[PDB]
């Protein structure tokens, strides 16, 4: 989820 600085 690229919407955050939190993905992968």
């Amino acid at each position: 989820d690229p919407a955050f600085g939190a993905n992968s």
Partner: single-chain antibody
Framework: QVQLQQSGPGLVKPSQTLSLTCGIS??????????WNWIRQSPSRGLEWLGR?????????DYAVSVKSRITINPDTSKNQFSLQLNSVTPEDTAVYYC??????????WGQGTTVTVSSQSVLTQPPSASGTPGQRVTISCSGS????????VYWYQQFPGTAPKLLIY???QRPSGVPDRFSGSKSGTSASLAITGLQAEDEADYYC???????????FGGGTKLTVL
């Protein structure tokens, strides 16, 4: 603490527009760490993510494939709220609608939900049902692909009937404070697992696996697993 208050009609005529409003308290709608989602749920469509809006130096909008051409999610910075607009509704759009906050890919805070009736790859793979006897360790699996689980975080939710899903596992294997350590998560390749040690009658609920798919450009949910304690 952060709470979300939902408002909207419980019935919309076909071909008409459904409008929902979600009020925020304890957080800003322009938060750099938050994203504001809409999710609906029905026996036919399952747990279906609808879309989201969020602020990263500008307002962004990510919509689901299924409702992209009919959906609009606008934030209101003054009233500190965000709305849902779905045009040309049909009986298929009959579901329970939730607004939820995403903070790290996890839907940690949910609204109580609004039942909306309309009258005159895409889904992660979970076992339809799981079961176990008290005291056992029970594990629920979820298989995906490189486009989703193989490349992104895995989240788990616990949902008791008539209530919004509760965050159980975030970031594959991390656990929010308050959640007992009986619940554990794991991820390897394109598969994930939710383990419940010391199974209790309390654990009888529906369990959902959640991730993100780059090919779908949106949040993807699993079919959900109904856990029965024998």
């Amino acid at each position: 603490q952060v709470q979300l208050q939902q408002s909207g009609p419980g019935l919309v005529k076909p071909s008409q527009t459904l409008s929902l409003t979600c009020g925020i308290s304890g957080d800003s709608v322009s938060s750099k760490s938050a994203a504001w989602n809409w999710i609906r749920q029905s026996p036919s469509r399952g747990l279906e993510w609808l879309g989201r809006t969020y602020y990263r130096s500008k307002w962004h909008n990510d919509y689901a494939v299924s409702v992209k051409s009919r959906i609009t999610i606008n934030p209101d910075t003054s009233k500190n709220q965000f709305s849902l607009q779905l045009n040309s509704v049909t009986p298929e759009d009959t579901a329970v609608y939730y607004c939820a906050r995403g903070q790290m890919g996890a839907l940690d805070v949910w609204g109580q939900g609004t039942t909306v009736t309309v009258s005159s790859q895409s889904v992660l793979t979970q076992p339809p049902s799981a079961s176990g006897t008290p005291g056992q360790r029970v594990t629920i699996s979820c298989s995906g692909s490189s486009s989703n689980i193989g490349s992104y975080y895995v989240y788990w939710y616990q949902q008791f009937p008539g209530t919004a899903p509760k965050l159980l596992i975030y970031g594959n294997n991390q656990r929010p404070s308050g959640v007992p350590d009986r619940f554990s998560g794991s991820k390897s390749g394109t598969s994930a697992s939710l383990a419940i040690t010391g199974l209790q009658a309390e654990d009888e609920a529906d369990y959902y696996c959640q991730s993100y798919d780059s090919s779908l450009s949106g949040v993807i949910f699993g079919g959900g697993t109904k856990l029965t304690v024998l």
